[PDB]
């Protein structure tokens, strides 16, 4: 329960897509799910959190993300 957090992925188009994820699940899972959800390809978008780029291997916990935080997505 406290191992789960809610996260938002915000696009330049003003689209917001919301995820519930375990803290130690790699962010890759959320990225690929976001891509399939939005009809996008990974090779053409990049993710940032607090202005810094995100690795697929990174977890929410390593980035000290908290409930309700936002990841931002841009065209590559």
């Amino acid at each position: 329960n406290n191992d789960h957090i809610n996260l938002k992925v915000a696009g330049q188009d003003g689209s917001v897509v919301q995820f519930k994820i375990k803290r130690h699940t790699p962010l890759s899972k959320l990225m690929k799910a976001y891509c399939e959800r939005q009809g996008l390809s990974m090779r053409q978008i990049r993710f940032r959190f607090d202005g810094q780029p995100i690795n697929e291997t990174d977890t929410p916990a390593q980035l000290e993300m908290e409930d309700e935080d936002t990841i931002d997505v841009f065209q590559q």
């Binding site: 789960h4 809610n6 897509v17 919301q18 995820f19 519930k20 994820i21 375990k22 699940t25 899972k29 959320l30 799910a33 399939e36 959800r37 009809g39």
Partner: protein
């Protein structure tokens, strides 16, 4: 919003069939889609606030609708008043 009304209609229809009711589906007042990545299988939860005339009288109803996988590729789980 269209894809969401088609869900809200289903929520109402299942409330009626699960409880022998005659609710009048109006429209979606509020809607959140949340993609749940906590399990081996991805699923999507919908959290819908829709209004429906009970006995013709306007009232506000909360609905949770479970969906296997992602939307762009169904089961009612709760339906109550506020």
């Amino acid at each position: 919003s269209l894809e969401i009304e088609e869900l809200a209609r289903f929520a109402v229809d299942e409330h009626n069939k699960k409880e022998n009711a005659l609710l009048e589906f109006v429209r979606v007042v509020k809607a959140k889609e949340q993609i749940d990545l906590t399990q081996e299988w991805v699923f999507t939860m919908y959290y819908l606030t829709l209004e429906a005339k009970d006995g013709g009288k306007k009232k506000l109803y909360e609905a949770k609708v479970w969906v296997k996988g992602l939307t762009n590729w169904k089961e009612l789980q709760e339906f109550k008043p506020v």
